[PDB]
């Protein structure tokens, strides 16, 4: 209590009432601990802190369902370039529309 009463992580003080324990890991391996806690329902996951941000059990299950980091990191560049990609696609589609219409008219004829 004295340690966290004068710290950044003072929001975890209400969590520490009665018997408590800390599940500690270098990497956020939440899926396996969740799945093994599923076996014994009486055990509640009160909350915790991952990557310097606090989180609740609902948040824990949301994070467990979440995919990894690298695909999101890659999609960041795609989201940034989406505007240019859309402009290029709109430039392309007008000449491409004629070709698509000709191809469709092949089916109709």
């Amino acid at each position: 209590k004295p340690f966290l009463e004068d710290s950044k992580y003072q929001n975890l003080l209400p969590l520490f009432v009665g018997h408590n324990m800390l599940l500690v890991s270098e990497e956020p391996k939440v899926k396996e601990m969740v799945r093994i806690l599923r076996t014994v329902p009486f055990l509640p996951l009160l909350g915790g802190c991952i990557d310097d941000t606090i989180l609740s059990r609902q948040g824990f299950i949301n994070y467990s369902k979440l995919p990894s980091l690298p695909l999101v990191q890659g999609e960041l560049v795609g989201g940034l370039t989406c505007l240019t990609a859309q402009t290029h696609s709109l430039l392309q589609h007008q000449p491409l529309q004629l070709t698509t219409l000709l191809d469709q008219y092949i089916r109709e004829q």
């Binding site: 000449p95 491409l96 070709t99 000709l102 191809d103 008219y105 092949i106 004829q109």
Partner: peptide, 29 residues
């Protein structure tokens, strides 16, 4: 050149002629 006769050319011409139009358009565009 005029918009009118392009549309008539597409519809009136046969299927093998309109097919040749597509392949020429791919390399130009």
């Amino acid at each position: 050149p005029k918009i009118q006769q392009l549309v008539q050319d597409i519809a009136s011409l046969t299927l093998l002629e309109i097919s040749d139009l597509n392949e020429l358009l791919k390399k130009t565009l």
